[PDB]
């Protein structure tokens, strides 16, 4: 078979998509290589179709031996809602990067002028990442431009079709026969309408709307998850107060995929065929690495298989020694989650660690902590115009030193529900209803919880580990309180949320849908900052406050 060894060459960085498109050589090589692996036949193991067929459809083994190897559970190889999510989606990007750099290495020999620079550029070609937490609105070259300007083989700037917008099937795999819409669709569709038409213009607007919420979710996900169960999966874990890596991962899949109807990107069986997928999960891997800098010594714990993949049947106990199928290091040994702590083993890194390249684990944590405080944190007011926002900035951002200890309430919208109740991907919208419920207002929009579903299991060999998984999500309210109120007291924020008529709506496709396992509430956690620390701690004096009568359902 094909061993997942990663890209060749030295240890090179995965560049930001903002900077990757400005480098002519890297962008040209990326377009050429991507079109190269796209035009190959869908039966070849090194094609875009086979690599995308690992995350979902088809339900066939990838790179398997001629000799017999039965499949334990027929589903996609993707491992979602378990402890193996980040590591599996870590090596999964490495194989795609490996073959993509192989094709680009073949294309580099097809040039004529500067044959030494264009080949070395192919040796350093790493999959760029889309920093959704900072700039949710991406550049035009990856979602909006039908044609892109690159450099031809002779050295002239030419205009070619962009292979990043979409992917044409050739042909549509018969396994998609019984799946609606996906069988009739020629190419992948982002943000579809009721007439099966791709609506990219509305998608841009949406991202521009969800920029702030995505920023806060990314920040709190990176800084306030100290254990593996609270960081890697959907599962409702005790004493949680921030989104997990997988939830923030779901937000992008739901932004690009779910429009008036369900698209490719919002279905776990067809998500990998969208070329933007690899730009998202690259940044996800970056999020993992950043988290590794903040919490060293915290890695994969043991957990059960909740929904079931092709690697493990529902009920299998998974740990750091589990086999990350179908990714192998040698022809007789599959990858495990243990060696995946060092990205340098796979010949790639990220520019966030450029300033501390070769430092102690103590210093890397401080630099990355400060870097997250400045990149995704909350800035303070100009000239002290809003003191409440300065107090909010001390807890969720850059912390100015103080003589006395500071205290405030951290407010969040917690929502818990039982996945697999409905077999359609949906979303929960939160907004203020004081102005009116018939216009999408930039200021009166809180956030949303998107659901990234796909194939559901039904039963097993009358096993016993089969337990309903509970998925939870968070939406932050602190910045909206700092804009209006002058304090974070519960007695004031109750009147703030009741006067502004904080409401929510569970929507699937276009019409409204209802589920019975949902429980939404507002949580106020007393946070205090001693005069010598910048990291907030739970205030063990005043108890946690829960409001379950403020939210309103709208249909
Ligand atoms: Cu996935
Ligand atoms: Cu994904």
Residue numbers in the entry: 3 to 557
The study reports:
Tyrosinases form an ubiquitous family of metalloenzymes and are found in all domains of life. Tyrosinases catalyze the ortho-hydroxylation of monophenols to o-diphenols (monophenolase or cresolase activity, EC 1.14.18.1) as well as the subsequent two-electron oxidation to the respective o-quinones (diphenolase or catechol oxidase activity, EC 1.10.3.1), which is coupled with the reduction of molecular oxygen to water. The purity of these preparations is further compromised by the fact that Agaricus bisporus possesses genes coding for six different tyrosinases (AbPPO1 - AbPPO6).
Herein, we describe such a protocol, yielding pure AbPPO4 in its latent form as well as providing access to the mature, active form of the enzyme. Here, the latent form of AbPPO4 is produced by E. coli at a yield of 110 to 140 mg per liter of culture. Latent tyrosinase crystallized in the monoclinic space group C 1 2 1 with 4 chains in the asymmetric unit giving rise to a unit cell of a = 287.30 Å, b = 52.09 Å, c = 152.66 Å, α = 90.00°, β = 98.03° and γ = 90.00°. In contrast to the crystals obtained with the enzyme isolated from the natural source which contained two different chains in the asymmetric unit (one latent and one active protein)33 and did only form in the presence of sodium hexatungstotellurate(VI) (Na6[TeW6O24] • 22 H2O, TEW), the recombinant enzyme formed crystals containing exclusively the latent tyrosinase. Inspection of the electron density gave no indication for any deviation from the sequence shown in Fig. 5. The amino acid side chains which form hydrogen bonds with the TEW polyoxyanion in the crystal of the enzyme purified from the natural source (HKKE starting at H116) are found in equivalent positions in the crystal of the recombinant enzyme but the lysine side chains are considerably more flexible as indicated by the lack of electron density beyond the Cβ-atoms.
